[PDB]
Amino acid sequence: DAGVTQSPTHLIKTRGQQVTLRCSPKQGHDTVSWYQQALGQGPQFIFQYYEEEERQRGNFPDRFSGHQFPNYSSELNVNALLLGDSALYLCASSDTVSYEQYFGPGTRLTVTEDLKNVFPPEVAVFEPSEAEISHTQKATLVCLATGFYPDHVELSWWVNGKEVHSGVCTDPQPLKEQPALNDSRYALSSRLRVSATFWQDPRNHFRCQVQFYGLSENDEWTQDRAKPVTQIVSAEAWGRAD
Amino acid sequence: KEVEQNSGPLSVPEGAIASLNCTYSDRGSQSFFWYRQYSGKSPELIMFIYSNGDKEDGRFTAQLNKASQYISLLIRDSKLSDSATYLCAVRTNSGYALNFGKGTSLLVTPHIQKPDPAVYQLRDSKSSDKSVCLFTDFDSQTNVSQSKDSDVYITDKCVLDMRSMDFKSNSAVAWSNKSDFACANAFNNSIIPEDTFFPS
């Protein structure tokens, strides 16, 4: 992209490990600023790099180090990772003449106690109730993704092979299945509402698709259960003349 | 801290004027920004301003008062798609980094034309034994309460828009794994409209 790019999309690590995050500024920008954003907070400034120098640094300890290369691209290295480092890490680029800081898409870091805390979602679709169809002439399907950790999934709906946005609402935050515990798994729901006539056509195919961000090949895995890799999990229903 | 705004959330009726404010402490601040951040995404720049007065951009107006050290964002004709966290940022002096406030969550709330509050039970398409409860078609004044019981899960309210029929509806979902659970029980924790439909 000629926009701000970052890699990787996500990282899952344990305490004490280290990470390097990468940023390329937007074409035409020469300054990069890194920020940490916790849930419910504003982005907190880590440092800014121009002409390969750290020009400003925010309230971040020495385990956050940075670098900017001659081609303007940048790295953020964090070591001796702590559980509290779990956050969205944002890169923003700017130039010396304009009023424009623009953010990249971010890298989500989870630092967890053990990779055995990582689980992919299970996904199920629940069919509209005949009571609703007869009461409203509308049909609501619910998709439920449960049991996942870390808490980043993206949920989409697909009707007869086409992604749909109309009639959809997905919870903006996953909910914690075990509120009282640090390594609680998560759930997320989404609804798709269609006319009862559309649901009542048995040729109509509805599929809830959940992208999970999990482990890769670089992660060791020696549990019995399947390695909880980055994956998509779907569920489906077909329409019915009831 | 350097940049102040309230978290909210703040609700605004669909179509009405949304107003957000931010104050800042450094009298040498020279540029001022509003960003918008939807769920799961990065902040997007929506406006910048650097001299006193108003700047208009479609339905957005930013206002800056350097003597009083505030900046405001006004949103005309508020849309459901305007629901987001809005973040103000200030740059003191030239080329510095942005200091962000904490963000204000804004919820744009539709008027429900024909409230029809109901709780329905939905079965899993893959086995009858598992199900979910759907509280739906309630008006925008109905609060949905977080569950008491730790084995019962209740989502926040969400608004869906069936765009081709210009139809909006609120819903919340609840579910549990204990059998003791019934959808009549499900949303009791919430003050529910008295006219609520409960077929099964």
Author numbering:
A (entry chain B): 1 to 242
B (entry chain A): 2 to 201
Sentences from the paper on this structure:
The majority of these studies have focussed on the immunodominant response through the p17 HIV Gag-derived epitope SL9 (amino acids 77–85, sequence SLYNTVATL) (6–23). Instead, in the face of SL9-specific CTL pressure, HIV has been observed to undergo preferred mutation at positions 3, 6, and 8 in the epitope. Here we use structure and protein biophysics to deconstruct how HIV escapes from the well-studied SL9-specific 868 TCR.
This resulted in an induced fit, or conformational pre-equilibrium binding mode where the TCR exists in two conformations in the unbound state, with the CDR3α loop “moving” 6.9 Å and the CDR3β moving 3.2 Å between the bound and unbound TCR structures. Comparison of the free and ligated TCR structures suggested an “induced fit” mechanism that involved major structural reorganisation of the antigen binding face of the TCR. The CDR3 loops made the biggest movement (almost 7 Å for CDR3α and >3 Å for CDR3β) to avoid steric clashes with the central portion of the peptide, while the CDR1 and CDR2 loops interacted mainly with MHC via a more “lock-and-key” interaction. In summary, the 868 TCR utilised an induced fit, or conformation selection, binding mode to form a pincer-like interaction around the central solvent-exposed portion of the peptide.
